[PDB]
Design a protein around this nucleic acid. Structure first.
Lengths: 128, 128
DNA sequence: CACATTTGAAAGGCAAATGGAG
DNA sequence: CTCCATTTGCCTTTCAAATGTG
C-alpha cells in the first residue's frame, strides 16, 4: 500500500542526504539497534522487493534509525565441500541423522549445517 | 600469468578459512593499510577480473594484509536531483563554471561532483 | 575539455538459515 | 525429522561517479 511505499522513497532521500550508503546503514543498524542487516536487505527495502510483511516488520526498525541518525551468520560452503556434498547427495538424497554425522565428521562440518544443506538441496531439486 | 593467479586462488582460500568475507577484508584494509577498498574490488581480485597491470598492483598489499592477519568516497545521487540535473542537461549540456556553482548551490551538492556529472553525462551521450 | 580507465554503490542470483505445520 | 515457504546475505555484476591521460 502507499503508506509503505512512500516511506521507502522518503527513506532513501534522507539516507542519501545524510551521506550514507545502504551498507553504512545496515551496519550502524546492528550497533544502534543490536540487530544486524545487510546492504542487500536495505537495498531490497528501499525498493519494495521485500514481502509486504517483511517490509511491514522492517519499516519501524528503520524509522527509528533515521530519526536517531538525524541469527546465525551465513556459513560459506567451499568448493571442495560442495563437490563432496553433491556427490553424497546423488548417492542418497535423504541421509539419516547418523549418516549425517558421518558426513559432517568426514568433512569437519557441524552436523546441523550438513542437515540443513541436504534439506535445502532436496528443496532445490524440487524446483524446475 | 600463472605467477599471479596462484595468489588469487590462494588468497580466497586463506580468506575463507580465516573466517572473512570479501567485504570484511574491505573494511579491514581500510584501516590497516589505511587505503580504500571495496568488496567489488576484493571480489574482482580473487576472480582475477582486475586488468593485468592493476591486479599486479593490488596483490602486494593484500598479501601484506593476509600475512599480517594470519580517494574520494563515491557520491550517491537522489532520483530527484538526477531528474533536475538531467532536465538541466537538456537545456544546456556544457554549463559554464559559474552555472555549475549555481546548480551545486541550488541542489546542495559539491561543485566538483556536479562538474563531473556533466562530463560523464556528455560521455554517456557519446556512446551509442 | 574530451575520452579511457578505475572503482564503488547498488542490485541480482543462488542458497544458508529460520520458521510453521505434519 | 520432514517438507515447504520465507527470510536474509555473500558474492557478483551493472552503471555511473571518480580518476587518470592527452
Amino acid at each position: 500500500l502507499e503508506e509503505l511505499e512512500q516511506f521507502a522513497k522518503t527513506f532513501k532521500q534522507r539516507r542519501i542526504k545524510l551521506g550514507f550508503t545502504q551498507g553504512d546503514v545496515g551496519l550502524a543498524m546492528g550497533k544502534l539497534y543490536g540487530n544486524d542487516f545487510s546492504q542487500t536487505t536495505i537495498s531490497r527495502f528501499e525498493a519494495l522487493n521485500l514481502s509486504f510483511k517483511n517490509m511491514s516488520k522492517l519499516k519501524p526498525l528503520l524509522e527509528k534509525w533515521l530519526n536517531d541518525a538525524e541469527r546465525k551468520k551465513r556459513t560459506s560452503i567451499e568448493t571442495n565441500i560442495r563437490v563432496a556434498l553433491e556427490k553424497s547427495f546423488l548417492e542418497n538424497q535423504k541421509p539419516t541423522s547418523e549418516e549425517i554425522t558421518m558426513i559432517a565428521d568426514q568433512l569437519n562440518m557441524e552436523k546441523e549445517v550438513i542437515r540443513v544443506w541436504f534439506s535445502n538441496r532436496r528443496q532445490k531439486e524440487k524446483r524446475i
